[PDB]
Design a protein around this nucleic acid. Sequence first.
DNA 1: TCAGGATGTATATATCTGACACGTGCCTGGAGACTAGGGAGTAATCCCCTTGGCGCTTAAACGCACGTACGCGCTGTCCCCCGCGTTTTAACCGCCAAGGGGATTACTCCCTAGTCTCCAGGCACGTGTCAGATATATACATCCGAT
Length: 263
Amino acid sequence: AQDFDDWFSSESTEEDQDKIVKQLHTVLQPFLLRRIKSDVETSLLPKKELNLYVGMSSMQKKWYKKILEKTRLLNIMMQLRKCCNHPYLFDGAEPGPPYTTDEHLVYNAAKLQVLDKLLKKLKEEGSRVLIFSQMSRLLDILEDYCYFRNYEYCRIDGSTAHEDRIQAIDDYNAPDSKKFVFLLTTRAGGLGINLTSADVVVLYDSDWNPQADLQAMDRAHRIGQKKQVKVFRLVTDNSVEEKILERATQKLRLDQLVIQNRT
DNA sequence: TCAGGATGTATATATCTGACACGTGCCTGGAGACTAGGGAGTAATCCCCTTGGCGCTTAAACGCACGTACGCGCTGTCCCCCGCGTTTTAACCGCCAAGGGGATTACTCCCTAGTCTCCAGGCACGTGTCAGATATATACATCCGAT
């Protein structure tokens, strides 16, 4: 790898004039054969994105500052991603006992406040949303929030057997089906699962590996999809999520400069 | 169940002694210079630990059901151990003898350690092998429980 990693001049970024990369274009030419889905009209429909930025909530603003300045408050970087997702995960941020599922849950979640409105705006359009979230515990908050709004939902997350998985996917992929939100996790098993009878997914949380979220949005974008599929990605503002997305971005963009110019 | 005894438990009192107070001499804790080296701060570099997860194999752990054997309660029946009176004898002071042992308090002085300077042999670390010990199967021998 010394002749492969370092010789390539620090990923050919700070010491390249689009020449050494041109060399590697033909270096690994006779080893790979990558053919684009653009050249075939299988999905025959390009995808769409938003990167909507969520003004961070109030009680979250308390916690994020609290985490910084010095309960198992270890691995700080991901802890801040919990605060950026929902403070209710911190065991105590939510109002104490007794426990009720009401609008107070919606207030203390900067993403969910924005997400709630958009979940309404697609209800009238006959869309069915496919939430993909990290930290399966985060699903439980959405699950109960789904229970609060009287929405049709089913869950297929980790620790659910495939026979449970297949009946769950049938409920969503049924003829004249009625499920609106169907929960998963960013991994959600292999590519095999068929979600082409859908039109909108939500990447509630981003990931370090963009390819790990590339195929997840391909779950909807797979073959047979006729209508346009809409993919969301909530991004916390002036927080840890800001740096993760660009970290994914440059790793994502690394693919194009290396692979996406051969064929 | 109630009156009849033996035993601490208080009471007050004369006596012994051993804590408490006081004064001196001596040594050591404090003040004050001087210095040098131990540790605190910095800043590379590599490896491990954390917190979220995800998917898979495969034994253990759990639950359920007979169904014994044993933990427990009762009874009996010794026999052994406790309470009490009676002797008696061994501990416990007091003594005597002489000398040795062990602690101090000086003096003296050899010799054996620490303290340095060089300098090479240990020994630890990073490699590259082989063989001792598994794991399976596989046939063998060898208790255990029911006819």
